[PDB]
Amino acid sequence: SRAEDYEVLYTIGTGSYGRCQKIRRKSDGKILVWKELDYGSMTEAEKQMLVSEVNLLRELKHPNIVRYYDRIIDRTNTTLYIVMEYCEGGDLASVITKGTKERQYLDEEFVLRVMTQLTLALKECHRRSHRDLKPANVFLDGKQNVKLGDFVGTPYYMSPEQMNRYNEKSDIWSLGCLLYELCALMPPFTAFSQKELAGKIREGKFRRIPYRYSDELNEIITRMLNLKDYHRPSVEEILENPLILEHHHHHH
Ligand SMILES: CCc1nc(Nc2ccc(S(N)(=O)=O)cc2)nc2nc[nH]c12
Ligand SMILES: [Cl-]
Ligand SMILES: [Cl-]
Ligand SMILES: [Cl-]
Fold first, then answer.
1. How many CA atoms lie within 13 A of 90 on its CB side?
2. Which Gene Ontology biological process is one annotated for this entry?
3. Ligand 1: residue whose CA is nearest its atom 5
4. How far apart are CA 59 and CA 65, in angstroms?
5. Which one is catalytic: 5, 38, 74, 132?
6. Which ligand is nearest to the CA of 180?
7. Pairing mode, if any, of strands 68-74 and 31-38?
8. What angle do CA 124, 130, 133 make, to 5 degrees?
9. Are residues 180 and 172 in contact, defined by beta-carbon separation less than 8 angstroms?
Protein backbone atom coordinates (compact mmCIF):
# COMPACT_ATOMS: atom_id res chain seq x y z
CA SER A 1 0.00 0.00 0.00
CA ARG A 2 3.09 2.18 0.35
CA ALA A 3 6.00 2.75 -2.01
CA GLU A 4 8.49 1.91 0.76
CA ASP A 5 6.99 -1.60 0.86
CA TYR A 6 8.70 -2.33 -2.48
CA GLU A 7 12.19 -1.98 -3.93
CA VAL A 8 12.63 -1.03 -7.58
CA LEU A 9 14.86 -3.57 -9.29
CA TYR A 10 15.06 -1.87 -12.68
CA THR A 11 13.14 -0.06 -15.40
CA ILE A 12 11.65 -2.58 -17.81
CA GLY A 13 10.58 0.04 -20.35
CA THR A 14 8.78 3.31 -20.92
CA GLY A 15 6.17 4.44 -23.47
CA SER A 16 2.38 4.57 -23.63
CA TYR A 17 1.00 5.39 -20.18
CA GLY A 18 4.17 5.92 -18.16
CA ARG A 19 7.21 4.04 -16.83
CA CYS A 20 7.20 0.27 -16.28
CA GLN A 21 9.50 -1.01 -13.53
CA LYS A 22 10.35 -4.47 -12.20
CA ILE A 23 10.09 -4.40 -8.39
CA ARG A 24 10.32 -6.73 -5.39
CA ARG A 25 7.91 -6.81 -2.44
CA LYS A 26 9.87 -6.54 0.80
CA SER A 27 7.57 -8.67 2.97
CA ASP A 28 7.98 -11.92 1.01
CA GLY A 29 10.34 -11.07 -1.87
CA LYS A 30 7.69 -11.50 -4.56
CA ILE A 31 8.64 -10.22 -8.01
CA LEU A 32 6.13 -7.80 -9.53
CA VAL A 33 6.05 -4.79 -11.81
CA TRP A 34 4.42 -1.43 -11.46
CA LYS A 35 3.37 1.16 -14.00
CA GLU A 36 4.07 4.65 -12.65
CA LEU A 37 1.76 7.31 -14.10
CA ASP A 38 1.66 11.05 -13.43
CA TYR A 39 -1.84 12.18 -12.47
CA GLY A 40 -0.92 15.72 -11.40
CA SER A 41 -1.91 17.33 -14.70
CA MET A 42 -5.09 15.27 -15.05
CA THR A 43 -8.37 16.84 -14.01
CA GLU A 44 -10.40 15.63 -11.06
CA ALA A 45 -12.81 14.10 -13.58
CA GLU A 46 -9.89 12.39 -15.36
CA LYS A 47 -8.63 10.85 -12.13
CA GLN A 48 -12.21 9.79 -11.36
CA MET A 49 -12.47 8.12 -14.77
CA LEU A 50 -9.21 6.26 -14.21
CA VAL A 51 -10.22 5.31 -10.65
CA SER A 52 -13.30 3.51 -11.92
CA GLU A 53 -11.13 2.06 -14.71
CA VAL A 54 -8.63 0.45 -12.33
CA ASN A 55 -11.48 -0.65 -10.05
CA LEU A 56 -12.94 -2.65 -12.94
CA LEU A 57 -9.39 -3.86 -13.64
CA ARG A 58 -9.09 -5.01 -10.02
CA GLU A 59 -12.33 -6.92 -10.64
CA LEU A 60 -10.51 -9.22 -13.11
CA LYS A 61 -9.00 -12.55 -12.03
CA HIS A 62 -8.14 -14.93 -14.88
CA PRO A 63 -5.02 -17.08 -15.45
CA ASN A 64 -4.65 -15.60 -18.96
CA ILE A 65 -4.99 -11.93 -17.96
CA VAL A 66 -2.17 -9.93 -16.34
CA ARG A 67 -3.13 -9.95 -12.67
CA TYR A 68 -3.63 -6.68 -10.79
CA TYR A 69 -2.28 -6.55 -7.25
CA ASP A 70 -2.21 -3.08 -5.70
CA ARG A 71 -2.30 0.69 -6.24
CA ILE A 72 -0.03 3.23 -4.53
CA ILE A 73 -0.24 7.04 -4.51
CA ASP A 74 2.69 9.44 -4.01
CA ARG A 75 1.57 13.06 -3.74
CA THR A 76 5.21 14.09 -3.24
CA ASN A 77 6.10 12.94 -6.78
CA THR A 78 2.46 13.22 -8.01
CA THR A 79 2.87 9.57 -9.05
CA LEU A 80 0.32 6.74 -9.14
CA TYR A 81 1.84 3.24 -9.07
CA ILE A 82 -0.24 0.34 -10.39
CA VAL A 83 1.21 -2.96 -9.17
CA MET A 84 0.79 -5.96 -11.45
CA GLU A 85 2.07 -9.47 -12.05
CA TYR A 86 5.46 -9.77 -13.75
CA CYS A 87 5.63 -11.99 -16.84
CA GLU A 88 9.25 -13.09 -17.24
CA GLY A 89 8.83 -14.37 -20.80
CA GLY A 90 8.37 -10.86 -22.15
CA ASP A 91 5.98 -9.67 -24.82
CA LEU A 92 5.04 -11.32 -28.10
CA ALA A 93 6.32 -8.46 -30.27
CA SER A 94 9.82 -9.31 -29.03
CA VAL A 95 9.31 -12.99 -29.93
CA ILE A 96 8.23 -11.96 -33.43
CA THR A 97 11.27 -9.67 -33.63
CA LYS A 98 13.56 -12.53 -32.57
CA GLY A 99 12.03 -14.89 -35.11
CA THR A 100 12.36 -12.33 -37.91
CA LYS A 101 16.00 -11.55 -37.09
CA GLU A 102 16.96 -15.22 -36.66
CA ARG A 103 14.92 -16.36 -39.71
CA GLN A 104 13.20 -18.90 -37.46
CA TYR A 105 9.47 -19.53 -37.77
CA LEU A 106 7.55 -20.16 -34.56
CA ASP A 107 6.27 -23.62 -33.70
CA GLU A 108 2.64 -24.36 -34.52
CA GLU A 109 2.19 -25.63 -30.95
CA PHE A 110 3.11 -22.16 -29.68
CA VAL A 111 0.58 -20.53 -32.03
CA LEU A 112 -2.07 -22.94 -30.75
CA ARG A 113 -1.18 -22.06 -27.15
CA VAL A 114 -1.52 -18.34 -27.90
CA MET A 115 -4.79 -18.87 -29.79
CA THR A 116 -6.33 -20.98 -27.01
CA GLN A 117 -5.33 -18.83 -24.06
CA LEU A 118 -6.04 -15.48 -25.76
CA THR A 119 -9.47 -16.79 -26.80
CA LEU A 120 -10.15 -17.65 -23.15
CA ALA A 121 -9.00 -14.19 -22.02
CA LEU A 122 -11.29 -12.58 -24.62
CA LYS A 123 -14.17 -14.79 -23.45
CA GLU A 124 -13.66 -13.54 -19.89
CA CYS A 125 -13.53 -9.91 -21.03
CA HIS A 126 -16.73 -10.38 -23.06
CA ARG A 127 -18.39 -11.81 -19.95
CA ARG A 128 -17.62 -8.62 -17.99
CA SER A 129 -19.33 -6.14 -20.33
CA HIS A 130 -11.69 -0.12 -30.12
CA ARG A 131 -8.89 -2.10 -28.49
CA ASP A 132 -5.10 -2.42 -28.42
CA LEU A 133 -4.82 -6.17 -29.01
CA LYS A 134 -1.35 -6.47 -30.54
CA PRO A 135 1.88 -8.43 -29.91
CA ALA A 136 3.35 -5.74 -27.64
CA ASN A 137 0.48 -6.17 -25.14
CA VAL A 138 0.57 -9.99 -24.94
CA PHE A 139 2.97 -11.57 -22.46
CA LEU A 140 4.39 -14.95 -21.48
CA ASP A 141 5.11 -16.23 -17.99
CA GLY A 142 7.78 -18.81 -17.16
CA LYS A 143 5.60 -21.87 -17.84
CA GLN A 144 4.43 -21.14 -21.44
CA ASN A 145 1.28 -19.38 -20.20
CA VAL A 146 -0.10 -16.49 -22.27
CA LYS A 147 -1.44 -13.40 -20.50
CA LEU A 148 -3.39 -10.55 -22.07
CA GLY A 149 -1.94 -7.15 -21.18
CA ASP A 150 -3.56 -3.72 -20.84
CA PHE A 151 -0.34 8.34 -32.97
CA VAL A 152 2.17 7.65 -35.75
CA GLY A 153 1.87 3.89 -36.27
CA THR A 154 -0.31 2.26 -38.88
CA PRO A 155 -3.31 0.36 -37.43
CA TYR A 156 -2.39 -2.99 -38.96
CA TYR A 157 -5.11 -4.83 -37.00
CA MET A 158 -8.09 -2.51 -37.52
CA SER A 159 -11.18 -4.37 -38.69
CA PRO A 160 -13.25 -3.26 -41.68
CA GLU A 161 -16.14 -2.67 -39.26
CA GLN A 162 -14.08 -0.23 -37.18
CA MET A 163 -12.92 1.27 -40.51
CA ASN A 164 -16.29 1.78 -42.20
CA ARG A 165 -18.57 2.03 -39.15
CA TYR A 166 -17.18 -2.35 -33.01
CA ASN A 167 -18.15 -5.70 -31.49
CA GLU A 168 -16.78 -9.02 -30.24
CA LYS A 169 -16.11 -10.26 -33.78
CA SER A 170 -13.81 -7.24 -34.19
CA ASP A 171 -11.83 -8.69 -31.28
CA ILE A 172 -11.85 -11.94 -33.27
CA TRP A 173 -10.45 -10.14 -36.34
CA SER A 174 -7.66 -8.59 -34.26
CA LEU A 175 -6.83 -12.01 -32.80
CA GLY A 176 -6.72 -13.36 -36.35
CA CYS A 177 -4.23 -10.70 -37.44
CA LEU A 178 -2.09 -11.37 -34.35
CA LEU A 179 -1.99 -15.12 -34.99
CA TYR A 180 -1.26 -14.45 -38.67
CA GLU A 181 1.71 -12.30 -37.70
CA LEU A 182 2.87 -15.04 -35.33
CA CYS A 183 2.88 -17.58 -38.18
CA ALA A 184 4.15 -15.42 -41.07
CA LEU A 185 6.33 -13.07 -38.96
CA MET A 186 4.52 -10.17 -40.67
CA PRO A 187 0.98 -8.73 -40.59
CA PRO A 188 -1.63 -9.94 -43.09
CA PHE A 189 -1.96 -6.47 -44.66
CA THR A 190 1.09 -4.33 -45.43
CA ALA A 191 1.15 -0.76 -46.68
CA PHE A 192 3.14 2.45 -46.43
CA SER A 193 0.01 4.62 -46.50
CA GLN A 194 -3.03 4.34 -44.28
CA LYS A 195 -5.23 4.73 -47.37
CA GLU A 196 -3.47 1.83 -49.11
CA LEU A 197 -3.81 -0.21 -45.93
CA ALA A 198 -7.53 0.58 -45.80
CA GLY A 199 -7.91 -0.54 -49.41
CA LYS A 200 -6.06 -3.80 -48.80
CA ILE A 201 -8.04 -4.46 -45.61
CA ARG A 202 -11.34 -3.83 -47.39
CA GLU A 203 -10.46 -6.22 -50.21
CA GLY A 204 -9.63 -8.83 -47.57
CA LYS A 205 -6.85 -10.56 -49.52
CA PHE A 206 -3.68 -11.92 -47.94
CA ARG A 207 -1.10 -14.63 -48.47
CA ARG A 208 -1.54 -18.01 -46.85
CA ILE A 209 0.53 -18.48 -43.70
CA PRO A 210 3.77 -20.39 -44.44
CA TYR A 211 3.23 -23.96 -45.62
CA ARG A 212 4.93 -25.41 -42.54
CA TYR A 213 1.65 -24.64 -40.73
CA SER A 214 -1.31 -27.00 -40.91
CA ASP A 215 -4.24 -26.46 -43.24
CA GLU A 216 -6.45 -26.52 -40.12
CA LEU A 217 -4.57 -23.64 -38.48
CA ASN A 218 -4.62 -21.62 -41.70
CA GLU A 219 -8.33 -22.40 -41.95
CA ILE A 220 -9.16 -21.05 -38.50
CA ILE A 221 -6.96 -17.96 -38.88
CA THR A 222 -8.50 -17.27 -42.30
CA ARG A 223 -11.96 -17.63 -40.76
CA MET A 224 -10.99 -15.05 -38.13
CA LEU A 225 -9.95 -12.75 -41.00
CA ASN A 226 -13.28 -12.94 -42.84
CA LEU A 227 -14.53 -9.58 -44.08
CA LYS A 228 -18.00 -10.21 -42.65
CA ASP A 229 -18.00 -10.35 -38.85
CA TYR A 230 -20.86 -12.86 -38.79
CA HIS A 231 -18.65 -15.35 -40.65
CA ARG A 232 -15.85 -15.14 -38.08
CA PRO A 233 -15.91 -17.81 -35.36
CA SER A 234 -17.13 -16.94 -31.91
CA VAL A 235 -14.97 -17.68 -28.88
CA GLU A 236 -17.04 -20.84 -28.38
CA GLU A 237 -16.60 -21.97 -32.00
CA ILE A 238 -12.86 -21.28 -31.80
CA LEU A 239 -12.53 -23.42 -28.67
CA GLU A 240 -14.50 -26.27 -30.30
CA ASN A 241 -11.89 -26.64 -33.05
CA PRO A 242 -10.15 -30.06 -32.96
CA LEU A 243 -6.75 -28.30 -33.01
CA ILE A 244 -7.23 -27.04 -29.45
CA LEU A 245 -6.32 -29.56 -26.75
CA GLU A 246 -5.71 -29.55 -23.00
CA HIS A 247 -1.95 -29.00 -23.11
CA HIS A 248 -2.54 -25.78 -25.08
CA HIS A 249 -4.25 -24.30 -22.00
CA HIS A 250 -2.64 -22.62 -19.00
CA HIS A 251 -0.82 -24.66 -16.36
CA HIS A 252 0.29 -23.38 -12.95
C1 LIG B 1 6.82 -3.86 -20.19
C2 LIG B 1 5.48 -4.42 -19.73
C3 LIG B 1 5.61 -5.72 -18.93
N4 LIG B 1 6.66 -6.52 -19.07
C5 LIG B 1 6.75 -7.66 -18.37
N6 LIG B 1 7.88 -8.57 -18.49
C7 LIG B 1 8.96 -8.53 -19.46
C8 LIG B 1 8.95 -7.68 -20.56
C9 LIG B 1 10.01 -7.68 -21.46
C10 LIG B 1 11.07 -8.55 -21.26
S11 LIG B 1 12.46 -8.57 -22.44
N12 LIG B 1 12.10 -7.62 -23.81
O13 LIG B 1 13.70 -8.14 -21.80
O14 LIG B 1 12.80 -9.94 -22.82
C15 LIG B 1 11.08 -9.40 -20.17
C16 LIG B 1 10.03 -9.39 -19.28
N17 LIG B 1 5.81 -8.01 -17.52
C18 LIG B 1 4.71 -7.25 -17.32
N19 LIG B 1 3.60 -7.36 -16.54
C20 LIG B 1 2.83 -6.31 -16.75
N21 LIG B 1 3.40 -5.52 -17.65
C22 LIG B 1 4.58 -6.08 -18.03
CL1 LIG C 1 13.39 -13.10 -22.03
CL1 LIG D 1 12.04 -16.39 -42.31
CL1 LIG E 1 3.70 -18.21 -48.07
1. 9
2. cell division
3. 87
4. 12
5. 132
6. 4
7. unpaired
8. 60
9. no
Resolution (A): 2.3
Q: Which ligand is nearest to the CA of 21?
A: 1
From CA 211, how far away is CA 224, in angstroms rounded? 18
- Sign of the Cα torsion 116, 97, 173, 217 reads negative
Residue 16 one-letter amino acid:
S
Q: Is the CB of 237 under 6 A from ligand 1?
A: no
Answer yes or no: 38 catalytic.
no
Q: What is the CA radius of gyration of the chain?
A: 19
Exp. method: X-ray
* Ligand 1 nearest atom to the CA of residue 87, by list position: 17
Domains and CATH numbers, the chain: 1-43+67-87 (3.30.200.20), 44-66+88-252 (no CATH)
Which own/partner contact pairs does 36-45 have at CB distance under 8 Å and 24+ positions apart?
A: 36/79, 36/80, 36/81, 37/79, 37/80, 37/82, 38/78, 38/79, 38/80, 39/78, 39/79, 39/80, 40/78
> Has 12 been labeled as part of a binding site?
yes
Ligand 1 pocket test: pick from 16, 33, 145 the residue with the most ligand atoms within 8 Å of its Cβ: 33
Strand order in the sheet with 19-25: 6-13, 19-25, 31-38, 79-85, 68-74
